DNA sequence: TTTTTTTT
């Protein structure tokens, strides 16, 4: 009896594989009685123990076949298309509220019965972003703002400051959120053809630490960026299309997705500072260190970098009705957890001890 | 039974879908009931909601084959071996019958039942446009009319003035109009000797930021794009045709497209002003800027950039012999539509709140 | 029953079609009924009207195979063998016996039903290039032929005359009736050996206006260009093979193709000086140049640049018995249609309006 | 009857083989009668012995098969696709469990019976290295922790010190104990894209004598790895992934590896020192030395460099708590095997004999 | 019925041709019917003409193939596989036998009946030849043997004398005569590393007018050949395997083959001097240039430049035992034709005429 | 056959 690729697809369409080895690899576990699997029982991975049982069957079968790979790349080909097929008709904004989708997904599995997150280690977290900058939260919706509307020619976003003033942290956590990518911009003018070529069908990207010159003058090491991004003014305006490299493929044609630049304290051209349409200063201080030194799960955990906490932040302080009308739904549910799970006392002995720069629990 | 081919590819054809992805992701949603589905129900997509009733059997039938990409790529050749026998075969003007007949039919779409948007915006838009600089619907005639015949030598076009003077916005508009592509000059030749590449099978192309020495005392660095340029004479003069290349494909050898460049204000070598038809001088217009910031939808919806301004634009200037017989049918029928819509008194009322820097509605 | 893969393999033959996907498109429209095909109603296109009728049967079952480029790229095979079969085997002559159809082919079109050019101003051309300098008709035959010969030694001239005097006009016209390409030499030697490169399987070469040392007292642009060629002995002489040199590639031997080389009246080296077969003077005459200020579409066509105007000057001037033996037919027809479009008398009038420097039409 | 691929997979799987030809070349031996096998009479190769019996019959119909390679390839395709399933889903410190668990399985056959090792030269070896640095054992505990919480911006440690002081000793002694690659960045800024290539889903990275520059007085050479070094900050930092190269393959996104740096007793920028977490001074020491050069099997069995000599010394000095659970009943067997062969007079009295740079062994 | 491969083969291995391309255009040619076949009955071509009668049936079949490339790659196989067997197997005396067949088989069409040259005009060529060298017979056949022994140290031959004083035309009818490939090696040290991969499995090498530096004395221009080849020193032996490389490529082992050394009268190390055979001193002598002025179809047909020339004198002058006893028959076949063409008389004849330096015939 | 190499 012959496998079923319809089933093999199904698969990879619920899971949302990109990679044929991924696939492969795990499709392949499901040959094991489901009834006996040590991975099911112990509940360690959603895509395993959520499909094992319903997929169990068709995995036996293709334990046998000789023809594995084929099928796994006409699974991975149907993943493949159907995000072309949305990249080139959903609106910015159906883009993000799918984007959120899966990070409350990731969150309900997180703070779930298994439950591996402690909300509380979290929810510190927020308050130390909350605290990084004047009315954060609304800071974020303005990004997230014309990120959506990708307004042609005000589609950048500059943060400058001195070192170790955390400017790349909040990049970081928003880069997480809307799932862009990073690029190197501090290179000879060649490499830049392949380099630029990943950022094919994101939403968003970011550039780090460009590299002004005369910089000793603030001990900044003079480099490439500055130079660099003036010769690539059309990318940062998106307001026309441009052409993407990939090693042993033709081109792919498109506008250039919007985003941040990073930058210590260089000078700058002012047909840069044109196209920047923002700008803010990030600057150090004291009690910030002190909190993390009393209080390293979170960077042990990775919590004040991650997008996850960004979303916190905004289900915590903005009106549900800055969301999209699906996803209001599930924002319901997550401000009734949160608000039942920490009193607004609690939160303000956190922000009250970060502020102190003391260890924010106690 | 067995997957049609025929109809696959027939499709393929009636979309111009010419993407292996796209077209297979597209026509696997034709596999669920058409009566359900909600996609036809929303009237959301034209290029599904007119055929998912007709491929619906057929693509059943796909969904359980084992060559699906296969299938795809034979029905793509077709498509784009189309496109090669009318790149040769048919008259300039002929294709600007063929490209106006695609505006026009999206346009039917976006101002059709949907009201997608309204009409009144846009001619807004096309207010603003003209209001850019003399004469404006006329001198677009007389670009079109350039690229159609495409007399050699007196064949190129240059756009000069500051940032912010719009070049780029009504280089973007004229693009969209005819289709083409852009692309980047201020390189090293051998770069830009792949680049060029580009080119085929299209009917226009346009050049962004040359950079030239003696622009560097102005916040406007240097490039190598002004002595590039100077020295592209083949595919600026038009007088022979020329390789066109490409990646695990062969080359082909064509008349280059004719086309526009633009620049801030450096110098020009004698030679290369010789070898434009025109030079246009573009400028900041004040009130411009105060009308567009209470217009705020004519770039959120990227209205002034695009090129079905442009044909709004020629429609409300124009004779009605400015065209072939064929659209003069649906030129006549659809200038009727903005009688309908507006009194000349509106588009007066537009254009003045335009010259008075208002919100362009009221 | 089947596709015949002969019949599209004749198809291809018979057109010389050498793109697979012009093939699979061309082929593609034969599959309507030839019966009402509203191209061949039209007769627009010969490559497509005389062939539908025949293959039309074939071409509907073409219409369904599942195999379709499969087929065209044995076709295409079939056409490049043919060509690399005959470029082995040919004589220099019968080359040229090609070159010399491919431009008739071109004139067919030019002054055809489309008029792109008009014949009376191109015949102008032919009068402004044979006032120039002796008998011009005869000095092109006489290099033409040599050109062919290719014997040893025999196979290089100079052209010594100063700025605006012609040479490079000249050699423009040279390359276009001839292919071939030009060269550079006023380098350091490392240059030398990629610029070489360029002549690999040329039918003609040209070298570039040379930088002669012993042209600095001249006030010429002067350096080590002649004292390269000076020491480049054999090259010109073509008794003996030489390597060639490709960036990114091997090394490959050729007897040097025969050319012309241009200068201003530099010093010279009487070894040097030894190799050329004719050294031709160059005079600036006021007649020319201010009877092409009245002639300008000889500019602006680049008539004068046309090596087509130099094939009307061989048709006009030369006897039918001097051209290939059995094309000299086709030239007849030419001489036919222009002896019919153009008395002696305006050809004649044409003559002596330059003659007296006046515009050749005035 | 036919070939089991299944049987082929299961046995790339129990070997963990990944080599297309070295999976070839070894299932291949099976084909003779395994009653004969001088091989496995020998009892020379685990990965023969312990398989020929079972495979055998498999493997003569496999001889006579014409897929061969295509069969070993499927195979080949199942082991790599466990890799990156564990790549993606487990934790840090599972994987290091899991390279414990190989290096353990690796010393059972050194130590066994049929084991080519002395236990006792083995132990000697600990002995050196705990002479080697203060309280090593600690050392070595922190560094683990460090590898495992991968704390972004405290990631990297510094080895510096004069030459022939045991630097890259100990680096490639952690390197085999944890899995990883060495890199040098000693180079032109080209090279470097391939060369951080290798560090593709690695465990650990070291980067291998980086060179300042200047201060010759120091009789150092120079050389571009610290001004490398100084830029590449993002890598070091580890906040955010990064893209990496392959020859023939497009950029892999991916979080870069923590490491080691070593280097000999170059000055550095501080802007380096912020972001190594510790740096550890080597001195050479005379009794070293003077012990090494008597004790030189250490040397001749690349004892010194060996990860299986840190694991000895984790299992002698650490308690057991400090092992992950499951690994803690091996490691108990183990310590009663080293305790059932080692009394602390033995270890005390071979740390004696190293302090008193006499051969460890008495 | 069905094609013959065999067939195909067999032609290809008659034939020797290694494009897939050339011998599938080739062999369609044979599909037209036989009896008619204008180009048989030119009998032009014998590649054709001596095949079509034979093939004609095969090739109507092979003219409906659906796979015709795969066969034609099947036939080039073969006989790219039979060249590399004999480039391993062949002893030298071999090769030139095999070498010496090909020129005997171009020999009998160029003067057989349809032969376009003429043997009389081929004599002058030898007689001419004759006179430029005491004893050219002996110098020649001595350097055969020389060749073909490949004896170590005893390999190399030194070229020197004026500018035209004939050293290249003999090295150009050499390397005609027994296969090879000239260098260059005036360069500076990188470039020779690429430029003695050239050699790499030939049978001679010339390295051209390599350049002595200073020398201006005797106005020789100064260049560094000479001293790059005293670097060579063991190139030159022959004694132990070089390593050989190439563009894109990898090294090859071999032992670097025999050749000849061209220079002006330059200034010799005495290292470099004891690296050769033999010195052969060429000079100008004028009645040569003056018979060369009234003969100069010589150079017109490229005569002297010709190993065929240089066959022809060794049948004219050498005893039949000399040649490999292989071709003895074809020798005495053609022995017994030149002294029927010619009497001593006529040769005699025409060596005196040569010594006046009138024109050789009368 | 691109890409890597080579060109630089
Ligand atoms: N505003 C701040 N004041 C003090 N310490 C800060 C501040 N922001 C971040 N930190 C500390 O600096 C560390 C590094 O932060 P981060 O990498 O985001 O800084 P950065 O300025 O963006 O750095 P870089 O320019 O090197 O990328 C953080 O982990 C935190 O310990
Ligand atoms: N003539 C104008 N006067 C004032 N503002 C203008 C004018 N034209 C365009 N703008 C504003 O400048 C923005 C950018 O226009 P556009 O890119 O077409 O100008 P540009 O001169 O081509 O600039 P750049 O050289 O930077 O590409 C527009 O979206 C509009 O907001
Ligand atoms: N003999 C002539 N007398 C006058 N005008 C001429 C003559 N020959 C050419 N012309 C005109 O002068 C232009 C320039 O001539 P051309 O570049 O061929 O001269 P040149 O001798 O090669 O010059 P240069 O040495 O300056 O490059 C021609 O394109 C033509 O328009
Ligand atoms: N601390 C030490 N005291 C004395 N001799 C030493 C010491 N460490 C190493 N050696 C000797 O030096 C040899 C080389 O050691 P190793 O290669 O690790 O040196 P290194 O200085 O750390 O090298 P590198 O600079 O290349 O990393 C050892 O085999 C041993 O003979
Ligand atoms: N010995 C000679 N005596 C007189 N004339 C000669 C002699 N040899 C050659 N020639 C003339 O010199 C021309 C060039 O000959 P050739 O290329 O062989 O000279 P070469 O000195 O060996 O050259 P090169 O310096 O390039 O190696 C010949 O075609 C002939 O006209």
Not at 75 to 95: F, G, P
Request: with cysteine.
């Amino acid at each position: 009896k012959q496998v079923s690729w319809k089933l093999v697809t199904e698969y990879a369409m619920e899971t949302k594989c990109d990679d044929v080895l991924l696939l492969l690899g795990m499709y392949l576990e499901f040959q094991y009685s489901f009834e006996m699997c040590l991975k099911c029982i112990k509940k360690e991975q959603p895509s395993h123990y959520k499909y094992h049982e319903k997929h169990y069957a068709n995995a036996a079968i293709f334990a046998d076949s000789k023809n594995q790979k084929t099928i796994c790349q006409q699974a991975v080909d149907t993943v493949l298309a159907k995000k072309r097929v949305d990249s080139l008709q959903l609106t910015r904004e159906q883009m993000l509220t799918n984007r959120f989708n899966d990070l409350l997904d990731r969150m309900d599995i997180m703070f779930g019965s298994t439950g591996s997150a402690d909300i509380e280690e979290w929810m510190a977290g927020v308050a130390w972003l909350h605290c990084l900058l004047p009315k954060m939260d609304s800071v974020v919706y303005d990004f997230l703002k014309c990120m959506v509307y990708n307004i042609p020619k005000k589609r950048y976003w500059l943060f400058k400051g001195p070192i170790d003033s955390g400017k790349t942290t909040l990049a970081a956590a928003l880069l997480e959120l809307c799932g862009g990518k990073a690029l190197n911009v501090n290179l000879p003018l060649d490499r830049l053809n392949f380099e630029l070529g990943v950022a094919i069908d994101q939403f968003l990207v970011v550039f780090e630490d460009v590299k002004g010159t005369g910089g000793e003058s603030r001990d900044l090491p003079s480099g490439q960026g500055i130079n660099n991004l003036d010769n690539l003014r059309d990318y940062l305006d998106g307001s026309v299309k441009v052409n993407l490299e990939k090693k042993h493929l033709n081109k792919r044609t498109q506008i250039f997705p919007p985003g941040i630049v990073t930058m210590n304290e260089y000078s700058v051209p002012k047909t840069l500072q044109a196209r920047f349409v923002k700008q803010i200063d990030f600057r150090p201080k004291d009690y910030l260190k002190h909190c993390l030194e009393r209080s390293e799960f979170l960077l042990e955990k990775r919590i004040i970098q991650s997008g996850i906490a960004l979303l916190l932040m905004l289900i915590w302080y903005r009106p549900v009705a800055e969301f999209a009308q699906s996803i209001q739904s599930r924002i319901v549910e997550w401000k009734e957890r949160l608000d039942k799970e920490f009193s607004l006392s609690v939160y303000q002995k956190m922000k009250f001890n970060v502020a102190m720069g003391i260890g924010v629990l106690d």
